[PDB]
Amino acid sequence: HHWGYGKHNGPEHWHKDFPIAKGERQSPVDIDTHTAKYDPSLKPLSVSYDQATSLRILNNGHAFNVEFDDSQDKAVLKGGPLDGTYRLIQFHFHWGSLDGQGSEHTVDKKKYAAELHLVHWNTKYGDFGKAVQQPDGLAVLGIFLKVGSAKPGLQKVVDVLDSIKTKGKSADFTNFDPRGLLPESLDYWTYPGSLTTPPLLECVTWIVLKEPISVSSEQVLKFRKLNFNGEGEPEELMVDNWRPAQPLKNRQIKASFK
Ligand SMILES: N#Cc1ccc(N(Cc2ccc(OS(N)(=O)=O)c(Br)c2)n2cnnc2)cc1
Ligand SMILES: [Zn+2]
Ligand SMILES: [Zn+2]
């Protein structure tokens, strides 16, 4: 009746409504460090988030998202395997029902507690809507979350979740600096892929950081208090909103580090 993450409308069923689910460059994938290829031609990532302007945070029934004002050439991502400039539009997370799972990408089959996705679109296409129709339209920066010490820059996000528990709930969320969610190193793996949720379009250049950020057990626990349902409907906790690894096919994962 609509896609979701349940047993009867989850990832395994998506191909019926979106045939591209069985495509040639689907994401996420397992990053095999035995086969990842170091490429000396890969340039360092250039992240310019000082002018980032957050607007609001909302629960859309798939996860929670923080939206940014991508009107001006404010926060942009460039460098790395990218040609041109990509503007930050929003970020969201994927997590599990327990600390042992939750990430979309995996490294040598290892799953992390959660995964953060910072979504950017190629300015040469004018807007996000036109960018998703192009093979090089989007660039998503993926960051793994491991459980350990708390991440100070994430607390503002965690504390506001109590106010957007159900689908449709939103809350003003201005002055949030995404630089507080980045790890020390920007070394990365990159490969051509797709959106991990329907419509599953193959328009993404994936940039997955090698270094995960540490978040406390208390912080991740708050993620699991959200609901997939809207206020008034049967309670269904928002957990395990991740897609399993897909076939690598004829693709090569490149590493920016030796
Ligand atoms: N049709 C359609 C459609 C679906 C989702 C969006 N996203 C949110 C969004 C959600 C998932 C996503 O893919 S992912 N998991 O980051 O790989 C990406 Br990439 C972007 N969105 C919302 N506002 N800016 C982007 C936009 C259009
Ligand atoms: Zn080996
Ligand atoms: Zn995502």
UniProtKB/Swiss-Prot annotation:
The modification Phosphoserine is found at S163, S170. The active site is at H62. Changing V119 to A/G/I/L/S: Reduced CO(2) hydrase and p-nitrophenyl acetate esterase activities. Optimum pH is 6-8. GO terms for cellular component: apical part of cell; cytoplasm; cytosol; extracellular exosome; myelin sheath; plasma membrane. Transmembrane segments: none annotated. Activated by X-ray, histamine, L-adrenaline, L- and D-phenylalanine, L- and D-histidine, L-His-OMe and beta-Ala-His (carnosine). Changing L195F: Normal activity. Changing H62A: Reduced CO(2) hydrase activity, rescued by 4-methylimidazole (4-MI). Reduced proton transfer. Enhanced proton transfer. Enhanced proton transfer capacity. Zinc. Can also use cobalt(II) with lower efficiency, but not copper(II), nickel(II) and manganese(II). Changing T196 to D/E: Strongly reduced activity, but enhanced zinc affinity. Keywords: Acetylation, Cell membrane, Cytoplasm, Disease variant, Lyase, Membrane, Metal-binding, Osteopetrosis, Phosphoprotein, Zinc. Changing H92 to C/D/E/N/Q: Strongly reduced CO(2) hydrase and p-nitrophenyl acetate esterase activities, impaired stability of zinc binding. Zn(2+) binds at H92, H94, H117. It is found in: Cytoplasm; Cell membrane. The record marks Q90 as: Involved in the binding of some activators, including histamine and L-histidine. Changing H92Y: In OPTB3; partial loss of activity. It holds the Pfam family Carb_anhydrase. Substrate binds at T196, T197. Belongs to the alpha-carbonic anhydrase family. Catalyzes the reversible hydration of carbon dioxide. Can also hydrate cyanamide to urea. Stimulates the chloride-bicarbonate exchange activity of SLC26A6. Essential for bone resorption and osteoclast differentiation. Involved in the regulation of fluid secretion into the anterior chamber of the eye. Contributes to intracellular pH regulation in the duodenal upper villous epithelium during proton-coupled peptide absorption. Target of drugs used in treatments against glaucoma disorder and breast cancer. This is Carbonic anhydrase 2.
